[PDB]
Amino acid sequence: MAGFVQAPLSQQRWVGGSVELHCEAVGSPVPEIQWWFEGQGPNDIMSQLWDGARLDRVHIHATYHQHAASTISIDTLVEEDTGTYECRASNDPDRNHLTRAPRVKWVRAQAVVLVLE
C-alpha cells in the first residue's frame, strides 16, 4: 500500500505571486505521485495537472529513492488558480492503464489555495 508522511498545506496567496505545494509518501514498491486540481463553483471537477500546464506556469518535480517526494510550483498566479489541489499516491501495478479490471484507488491528500487580488 501507499501512505502519506507529508500532505500539501492550504494557503492564501496574491494575484501575481507564486505558490509551492509539497507531498511525500511511502510504500513498497515506492509509490508514484500525481497532482490533481478542482476549481471553485459547482461546475468544476477534479482533473490531473501535468508538468508544463497552464501555459507552462505549472511545474512538477519528483524523486523516488526510498520514498516518494513531489513538489508542484505555479508561476505568476491568477485568480482562477484558486481551488483544491490534491496529491495522489499509489504503488498498485495496474494503476497505469489496465484493462477493465477497472479500478485502482489512489490515496488522496488535499490543500486549498486561495488567490486574492
Question: Contact residues for a copy of itself (CB under 8 A)?
Answer: 1-12, 27, 42, 84, 103, 105, 107-112, 114
Q: Which residues contact 93 (CB under 8 A, 6 or more apart)?
A: none
Q: Dihedral sign for Cα 76, 81, 85, 91, please.
A: negative
C-alpha cell at 60: 512538477
By beta-carbon proximity to a copy of itself, the closer residue of 60 and 114 is 114
Rounded Cα distance, 54 and 71, in Å: 16
Shortest spacing between CB 48 and a copy of itself, in angstroms? 17
Shortest spacing between CB 64 and a copy of itself, in angstroms? 17
In the numeric block, the cell 515506492 is attached to 30
Shortest spacing between CB 55 and a copy of itself, in angstroms? 26
Instruction: Tell which residue, 50, 22, 24, 56, has the closest CA to residue 36.
Output: 50
The helix/strand/coil state of 16 is coil
By beta-carbon proximity to a copy of itself, the closer residue of 53 and 107 is 107
Shortest spacing between CB 67 and a copy of itself, in angstroms? 12
By beta-carbon proximity to a copy of itself, the closer residue of 52 and 104 is 104
By beta-carbon proximity to a copy of itself, the closer residue of 41 and 56 is 41
